[PDB]
């Protein structure tokens, strides 16, 4: 379970980093911003999959 804890911490850090990079994309070249948006969502989705296996 420590592996799942450290995976969720590194995933949260990467999610914050990707949020920063995506808002920078919106800042400079927003025309392709969606190219990252769903990507971030995937990470959120992977956090939700960990939080689903975490229910039983």
């Amino acid at each position: 379970y420590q592996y799942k804890i450290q995976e969720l911490r590194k995933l949260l850090k990467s999610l914050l980093l990707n949020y920063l990079e995506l808002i920078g994309v919106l800042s400079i070249n927003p025309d392709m911003y969606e190219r990252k948006v769903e990507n971030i969502r995937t990470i959120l989705v992977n956090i939700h999959h960990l939080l689903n296996e975490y229910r039983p």
Binding site: K13, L16, L17, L20, E21, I23, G24, V25, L26, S27, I28, N29
Partner: protein, 43 residues
């Protein structure tokens, strides 16, 4: 008016991401290296 709005919003966004990068470096030094690369990915 549209051009002035564009320039003002560009300046605002630039200061936004500069401050966000600075604080992410401050409280999260371990993520400092990618953040600069993020600038290199954006600028």
């Amino acid at each position: 008016r549209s051009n002035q709005y564009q320039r003002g919003k560009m300046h605002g966004l630039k200061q936004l991401r500069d401050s966000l990068a600075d604080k992410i470096v401050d409280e999260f030094p371990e993520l400092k290296e990618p953040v600069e690369d993020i600038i290199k990915r954006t600028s």
